[PDB]
Subunit: 81 residues, 3 copies
């Protein structure tokens, strides 16, 4: 009767010890996660793809400008002769 209670107490202690270990483990796993305060969210940042597309847009305008410059240099050389 009393020994049956002792066996159940031992059982409980074991389950508690397991729980304490799961908690110690969880605390360490938490330490490996990035804090909201030190990381930008998706709404605050562009992806590589998005940046790539914006850079192409600029490169295009620059190509347009260079081709206009080259055409103007040719016109000037014709006027000169």
């Amino acid at each position: 009767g009393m020994k049956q209670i002792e066996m159940k107490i031992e059982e409980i202690l074991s389950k508690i010890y397991h729980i304490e270990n799961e908690i110690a483990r969880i605390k360490k796993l938490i330490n490996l996660k990035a804090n909201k305060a030190d990381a930008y969210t998706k709404d605050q940042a562009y992806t590589k793809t998005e940046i790539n597309s914006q850079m192409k847009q600029i490169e295009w305008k620059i190509e347009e400008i260079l081709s206009k410059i080259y055409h103007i240099e040719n016109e000037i050389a014709r006027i000169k002769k």
Copy 2:
């Protein structure tokens, strides 16, 4: 006396099982967090706003260049004529 111990044992078993469930749940919530090792910190990356401001600066120079080009094309058409 012994029944009072049994009641308390039942109470403890219930709590333990609730605790175990809270822990299983916590483990799942941890798995949805990003690791420090796989995410850039705020000092490593620019925000959308910062990129937008850098792109604007460039777009504004490009506009200035295009307006100079349009002016030059006009001068050249006058010289020719």
Copy 3:
């Protein structure tokens, strides 16, 4: 015999209450970590250094364009008189 069981019961109650508190704490610490769903990984985004290098490349083409534009403006002024 019965008092030895009571002592062990007291010990278990104490630990459980501590555990419940550690869990409440842990839940709050978890809320401060960034979710995988709201953060980009390192391979999805460019760093400041990488963006800086792409912006330099563009600035160099712009410098080249400006000097050509300045030279062309001078030629045009000479042709005019």
